[PDB]
Amino acid sequence: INDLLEACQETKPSISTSELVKLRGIYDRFQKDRNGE
């Protein structure tokens, strides 16, 4: 468990929040566009 916690602390998101929110917005707009509303 401790080694797992060390790995968790070391790990950082492969996606920076900027790209996360950008892609979320793009994908939501595409889903809505497909929904045609």
Place this chain on the structure above:
Amino acid sequence: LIELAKLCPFNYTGADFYALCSDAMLNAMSRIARMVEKKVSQHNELTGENISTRRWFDKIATKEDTKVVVKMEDFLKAQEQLTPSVSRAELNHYEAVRANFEGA
């Protein structure tokens, strides 16, 4: 069919209607496939004969089971799941094209 015509907005295209009908048929087929699966599973116990769905498809999948029957709810549910394949912005762009190519 008139109800479906009522529900559909004016952005649908022949591709959209084909996709909708395909999804409805797929839902009916999911119903049929599940019912055949229950047939096979239950018969595996009642007769104790674990006759895989293959043997049913070759010998016990009668014409009626092969027969495809669809219900309004299938098309309606697909319609709720349905999503047009073009943006109203693109429709307006093509309308702009039409305006110059049809009004003169």
